[PDB]
């Protein structure tokens, strides 16, 4: 979509979300490695098995 359900979806647990979108703010200054997951929800992260 255009709004939220792109990002904020199967988004149930935000320790998750926040920190793969806040860490990669603070990533930028501190933290070094790669990590964008929080537009993603492939079955690894809306499914949990």
């Given at each position: 979509?255009?709004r939220?359900?792109?990002?904020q979806?199967?988004?149930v ?37």
């Amino acid at each position: 979509g255009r709004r939220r359900r792109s990002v904020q979806w199967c988004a149930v647990s935000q320790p998750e979300a926040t920190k793969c979108f806040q860490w990669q703010r603070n990533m930028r200054k501190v933290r070094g490695p790669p990590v964008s997951c929080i537009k993603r929800d492939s079955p690894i992260q809306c499914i949990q098995a």
